[PDB]
Amino acid sequence: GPTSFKTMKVIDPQHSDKPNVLILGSGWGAISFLKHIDTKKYNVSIISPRSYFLFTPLLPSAPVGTVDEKSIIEPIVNFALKKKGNVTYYEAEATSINPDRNTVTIKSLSAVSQLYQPENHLGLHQAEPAEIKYDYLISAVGAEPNTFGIPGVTDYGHFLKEIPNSLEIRRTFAANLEKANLLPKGDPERRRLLSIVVVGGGPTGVEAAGELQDYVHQDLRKFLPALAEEVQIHLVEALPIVLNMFEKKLSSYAQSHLENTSIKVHLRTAVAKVEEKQLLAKTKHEDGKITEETIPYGTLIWATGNKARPVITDLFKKIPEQNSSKRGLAVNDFLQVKGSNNIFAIGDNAFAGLPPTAQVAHQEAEYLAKNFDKMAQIPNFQDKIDLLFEENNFKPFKYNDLGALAYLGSERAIATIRSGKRTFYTGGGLMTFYLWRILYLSMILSARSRLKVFFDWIKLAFFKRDFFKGL
Amino acid sequence: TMKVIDPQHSDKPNVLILGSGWGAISFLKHIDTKKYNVSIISPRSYFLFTPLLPSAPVGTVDEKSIIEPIVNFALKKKGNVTYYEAEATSINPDRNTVTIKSLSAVSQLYQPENHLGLHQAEPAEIKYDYLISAVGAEPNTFGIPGVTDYGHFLKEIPNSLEIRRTFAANLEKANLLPKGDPERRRLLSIVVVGGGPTGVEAAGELQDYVHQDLRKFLPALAEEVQIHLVEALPIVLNMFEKKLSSYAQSHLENTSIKVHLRTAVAKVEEKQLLAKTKHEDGKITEETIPYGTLIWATGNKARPVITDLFKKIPEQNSSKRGLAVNDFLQVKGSNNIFAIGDNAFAGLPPTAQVAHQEAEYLAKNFDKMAQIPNFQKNLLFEENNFKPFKYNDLGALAYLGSERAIATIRSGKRTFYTGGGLMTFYLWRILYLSMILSARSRLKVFFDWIKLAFFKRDFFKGL
Ligand SMILES: Cc1cc2nc3c(=O)[nH]c(=O)nc-3n(C[C@H](O)[C@H](O)[C@H](O)COP(=O)(O)OP(=O)(O)OC[C@H]3O[C@@H](n4cnc5c(N)ncnc54)[C@H](O)[C@@H]3O)c2cc1C
Ligand SMILES: Cc1cc2nc3c(=O)[nH]c(=O)nc-3n(C[C@H](O)[C@H](O)[C@H](O)COP(=O)(O)OP(=O)(O)OC[C@H]3O[C@@H](n4cnc5c(N)ncnc54)[C@H](O)[C@@H]3O)c2cc1C
Ligand SMILES: [Mg+2]
Ligand SMILES: [Mg+2]
Ligand SMILES: [Mg+2]
Ligand SMILES: [Mg+2]
Ligand SMILES: [Mg+2]
Ligand SMILES: [Mg+2]
Ligand SMILES: [Mg+2]
Ligand SMILES: [Mg+2]
Ligand SMILES: [Mg+2]
Ligand SMILES: [Mg+2]
Ligand SMILES: [Mg+2]
Predict the structure, then answer these.
(1) Do B460 and A52 touch (CB under 8 A)?
(2) Does B219 carry a binding-site annotation?
(3) What's the burial of A284, exposed, middle or buried (CB within 10 Å: 0-12/13-18/19+)?
(4) Which end of chain B is more exposed for a tag (fewer CB within 10 A), N or C?
(5) Where is chain B discontinuous (C–N over 2.5 Å), named by the preceding residue?
(6) Of A51, A111, A182, which is closest to B106 when you measure between CB atoms?
C-alpha cells in the first residue's frame, strides 16, 4: 500500500566526476566493449551472473574433450586487471532495467569485486536485491535458446549454449554408452542408447555432430569398436539445405562429407514433439506431402537459435518506441536503444537486421567504445544525445561481413573469408580445416585461453580425448 | 538366483585385481597378459596420482592432469583385460568368488565379445584362480565428532572439487562483509589437520594461491586469510631429519601459516572446532578455533570388505589394520589371495612407494609361476626358492609452498641427497614428474606447470 516500507538499496558511486558506465553481460558484446573502453575517462561496472567470458565457437568441441571446458573460458577479472582505471564486477543477474530512474535491478548476488585500492564498503548481502545506478547503460545480455513451443525439448533435450550444457551432454552420452554396452547386440534399446539427435543445421549443430562423430570414430572405436559402429548421429534441419549462409555448393560438399562420416541428415524436417525416449519428426517434402517419423533417441542436442530474454522483453513494455519489438531491442545508427537517451544495446539483445553472431557483436562493441572515446572529448555529452551524435558528425555503425567457417568432423571444414565485395578464400577440404584452427585460435580474446586451446590440440595429436562422465 | 562369471574359455588362469590405484595399476603394468587372463574390479575408472592431489584444489595442477583412465593402461596389454566399474562388497575365499554391487559398466578389451548378461545395480559374483587385493584404505576420523559432516577429506578427486567449492564460496561471502567483521575472519579461515607431507603441501598450495593469485585482484582479502596447520606430534614432517622439520616449520610460519603442534582436534562443529594442546609439561590447554574450511589430511583405516574378510580366514581373525601377509605377499591362510598396498599389513608404511614396489615384485613372481607347471595345478614358493619381498626405501619429499621443498634421496644404506631449499623444489618437480605412470598425465602436469609460469591458477567454483 501507500504505507509501504519498501526500501531498495541503491548503489550510486559519486567520488569522481567520471561518468558511470554500466555493462550488462560477460560475453562477446560486453567483454569486447570492456577491452576497448577508456577507464581513464569512465568508471566501469559490469553485471553478469557468469564470472567468465565464453569463447563460443569452440563450445561444440568441449562435450567430447577435443578442447577442455576451462580452456575456452576466461575470468572477467583477468580482463579487468588489464584496465588502468576502476572496474567493478557484480556477479549477479539483471532482472529489471529501470530507464526512467537510470537504474538496473539485480538479484542472485553471489559476489562483488572492486578492482581498485581504496575499496568502499557497499553494504550488499548475497541474495538481497539492489539497484545499480548508471550514467550510461550498455546492454549485452545476449539471448536464450528457443524451443518454439515444441513440448519436451526443455525437459528431455540439452541446449548447446553454456558450459554446463557441455557437461550435461557428456554425462548423458557417457551414461548411455555404459548401459548400451551391457545390452546384447540387436537389442533395440541398445540401438536407442547409442543414438544421438542434433537439431539445427547451422554451424553449431553441424560442428556438434562432427565433433561427436570424431570422438566415436577416433577414440571410442579404439576400445569399444562394436559399440562405436552402432552409434547413429542424426542431424535434423527444417530448411532444404544445411549451412544456408554459405554458397549452396559448399553446403552440398558439407552434407556429403557428413553423410560419408555416417551422420544421417534429415532435411525439410522439423521436430513436432519430444518425449523422454523418442521424438516425433515431420518432413515437408518438395511436392507438398508430409510424412511423420518417430525416432528413438538416447541423447538430444537442441541447437536451433535464440529468443529475447525476459529482462529484455520486460524493457520492451516500458519504452513506448520499443513496444513493437520482438527479436531484440531496436537501436538507431549509433546503437542507442530507441526511446532512450541513455541506453545502448549491442550483440544479440539488439536487433537491427544483422545476423546474430559474435562477429557482429564484436564489431558493435569496438565501434561503441570508440564512440565513447569521442563523447569524452565533447563536454556537452555529460534528451539531446541522438542529436549530439549527428551534430558532431559521428559515423553510423557499419557492419563489415568478414565471412564464415564450419568444421565438419574428420579434418574437413568449409570457409569463406571476405571483406567488402572482395573474397579472399572460399572452399572446403583438409587445408580449410587447418585454416579453421589457426583462425579460431587467432580470434580468442586472451593469451591464457589461447595457450590452453593450443595445448589441448597438441595433446590431441598424441592421446585420446578426455571423456570423463563426471569431471 | 545369483549370477556367476567364470571365464573358462582359456586354460589361462584368471587373475582378479581389486582396485585401480597404486597397487592395482602398477601390478597391471607388469603382469604378463599372454600367460594370464586379467580382470579388474573398481568403482573408480581411473588411476589417481595421489602425490599431486594436494595441489589440485587451487588449480596448480588440474584434476584431469593427475588421473589416467584404466582403459589406457589396459590397451597397452597384449592379452585380454576386462574392467568392471563396480564395488567389491564381499570376498568369498571358500568358493573363489568376489561379490560386486553398484555395477556401472563392463569393458571387455578383447575381440570376441561375450554377452555376460549383467545388468546395472544387480549383484554378481566374479570367479578367480588368483586374487590380487588392492582396494587401499579409507579416511579415518578417529571417532572425532563432526569431521565427516563438516570437514573434507583429502583422498579423492571429488574431495579436491569440494574444497575448492567450499573455499571459493567463503571468499565470496567474506568479501561482501565489512572489514573487522568476525564472520569475515571466520570465512577466511582454513584449518588443515595433519602434519605429514600431505597436510603440509595442502597448506602450502592454498597459501600459494592466496599470496600469488588472489592477492593480485583482492589484496585486502588475501591479507586476512589465515591458514592453520594442526599436528598431534611435537614436530611436522616427522619422518624426516628433525633439522629439515625445523626448516619446514620455520618456512611455513614465514609464509604466514599458523602451525599448532602437540594439538589434537577434540570435536568439530559446523562453524568452529575444539583444539587441545598437550604441553611437554603434561598440562592441557584448549582453543575454540572458528573456521570456514576444514581439511582433514590425516588417518587411514581398513575398508569393510577387508574387515569382513578377517572373520573368514582362520589366520586372519587377529588382524586390525590390514591383511596379514607372508614374505611373498600372500594372504596368510590362502594360496588363492594376495594383497598389496594399504589393504595389506607387512610392517611397512602405508605409502605409494611401498605399494608400487610390492606390485612390481609380485608381477615378477607371476612371471615365474607361469614357468612352474605345479602352480598351474598344485608353501610352494619356499621349495621353488622365490626370494621374499625386500622393500628398498628410496626417500621422501615435501613441497612447502613458496617454491621451497625438502627432500631426502636414498638407496639401501646410502643417502645421496638430503636438504631443503629453492633447488630442492625444482628437484621435487622433476622427481614427481618422473614418477607419473603414463605419458599423457606427465604431459598434462608439465603443461599445467608451464601455464602457471605465465598465468594465475584456474579457480572456478563449479568446474
Ligand atoms: C555453441 C555456439 C557456437 C557459436 N559459434 C559462433 C561462431 O563460430 N561464429 C560467430 O560469429 N558466432 C558464433 N556463435 C554466436 C555468438 O556466440 C553470439 O552471437 C554472441 O554470443 C552474441 O554476443 P552477445 O554478447 O550478444 O551474447 P553472449 O556472448 O552470449 O553474452 C551474453 C552475456 O550476458 C550474460 N547474461 C545473461 N543474462 C543476463 C542477465 N539477466 N543480466 C546480466 N547478464 C546476463 C551471459 O551470462 C553472458 O555473459 C555461437 C554461439 C553458440 C551458442
Ligand atoms: C593426498 C595424498 C597424497 C599422497 N602422497 C604420497 C606420496 O607423496 N608418496 C607416497 O609414498 N605415498 C603418498 N600417499 C599415499 C599413497 O597414496 C597410498 O599409500 C597409496 O594409495 C597406496 O596404494 P593402494 O593401491 O594400496 O591404495 P589406492 O592408491 O588408494 O588404491 C585403492 C583403489 O581401490 C579402489 N577401491 C576402493 N574400494 C574398492 C572396492 N570396494 N572394490 C574394488 N576397488 C576399490 C579405489 O577406487 C582405488 O582405485 C598419498 C596419499 C594421499 C591421500
Ligand atoms: Mg555480452
Ligand atoms: Mg556466451
Ligand atoms: Mg546482447
Ligand atoms: Mg547469447
Ligand atoms: Mg589421437
Ligand atoms: Mg590399487
Ligand atoms: Mg590412487
Ligand atoms: Mg591396497
Ligand atoms: Mg588408500
Ligand atoms: Mg564450512
Ligand atoms: Mg601464478
Answers:
(1) yes
(2) yes
(3) middle
(4) N
(5) 378
(6) A182
Q: Which of A375, A377, A376 is nearest to A386 (CA)?
A: A375
Span from the CA of B240 to the centroid of ligand 9 (angstroms): 24
Contacts of A101 (CB under 8 A, 6+ apart): A131, A133
- Residue A303 near residue A202 (C-beta atoms within 8 A): yes
To the nearest whole Å, the CA of A265 is away from the closest chain B CA by 31
The resolution, in Å, is 2.5
Q: How far apart are CA A367 and CA A346, in angstroms?
A: 10
Query: Could you tell me the CA-to-CA distances from B372 to B328, B375, B377 in Å, in that order?
Result: 16, 6, 9
Side chain identity at A326, as an amino acid letter? K
Contact criterion met (CB < 8 Å) for B176 and A81:
no
Judged by CB atoms closer than 8 Å, whether chains meet at B176 and A80 is answered as: no
Alpha-carbon gap, residue B102 to B93, rounded angstroms: 21
Residues with Cβ within 8 Å of residue A270, at least 6 apart in sequence: A236, A238, A281, A282, A284
Judged by its nearest atom, the ligand closest to the C-alpha of residue B295 is 12
- Is B190 assigned a ligand-binding role in the annotation? yes
Cβ–Cβ of A81/B217 closer than 8 Å? yes
The CA-CA-CA angle for residues B445, A27, A148, to 5°, reads 115
Spatial strand order of the sheet with B263-268 comes to: B263-268, B272-278, B284-290
Structural domains of chain B, ranges and CATH numbers in brackets: 1-463 (3.50.50.100)
| Binding-site entries of A for FAD | 20-50
Query: Measured in whole angstroms, how far is the alpha carbon of residue A85 from the centre of its chain?
Result: 28
Q: How many Cβ atoms are within 10 Å of B294's Cβ, its own excluded?
A: 25
Q: How far apart are CA B262 and CA B284, in angstroms?
A: 10
Biggest CA–CA distance in chain A, Å, is 77
Experimental method: X-ray
CB within 8 Å: A471 and B63: yes
Supply the Cα-derived Rg of chain B in whole angstroms.
24
Question: To the nearest whole angstrom, how far is the Cα of A272 from the nearest Cα of chain B?
Answer: 33
Q: What is the three-state SS of chain B?
A: CCEEECCCCCCCCEEEEECCCHHHHHHHHHCCCCCCEEEEECCCCEEECHHHHHHCCCCCCCHHHHEEEHHHHHHCCCCCEEEEEEEEEEEECCCCEEEEEEEEEEEECCCCCCCCCCCCCCCEEEECCEEEECCCCEECCCCCCCHHHHCEECCCHHHHHHHHHHHHHHHHHHHHCCCCCHHHHHHCEEEEECCCHHHHHHHHHHHHHHHHHHHHHCHHHHHHCEEEEECCCCCCCCCCCHHHHHHHHHHHHHCCCEEECCEEEEEECCCEEEEEEECCCCCEEEEEEECCEEEECCCEECCHHHHHHHCCCHHHCCCCCCEEECCCCEECCCCCEEECHHHEECCCCCCHHHHHHHHHHHHHHHHHHCCCHHHHHCCCHHHHCCCCCCCCCCEEEEECCCCCEEEEEEECCEEEEEEEEHHHHHHHHHHHHHCCCCHHHHHHHHHHHHHHHHCCCCCCCCC
What are the strands of the beta sheet with A278-284, ordered from one edge?
A269-274, A278-284, A290-296
How many angstroms away from the CA of A124 is the closest CA of chain B? 6
Give the distance (Å) from ligand 1 centre to CA of residue A22: 18
- For ligand 2, say whether the CB of B88 is within 6 Å of any of its atoms: yes
Strand partners, B83: B40, B107
Tell me which chain A residue has its CA closest to the CA of residue B444. Answer: A459
| Calpha distance A256→A249 (Å, rounded) | 11
CA–CA separation, A371 vs A221, rounded Å?
54
The environment of the single-atom ion ligand 8, i.e. residues with CB closer than 5 A, is B 19, 21, 23-24, 134
Residues 6 or more apart in contact with residue A33 via CB below 8 angstroms: A23, A138, A140, A346, A365, A366, A368, A369
B263 lines ligand 2 (CB under 6 A): no
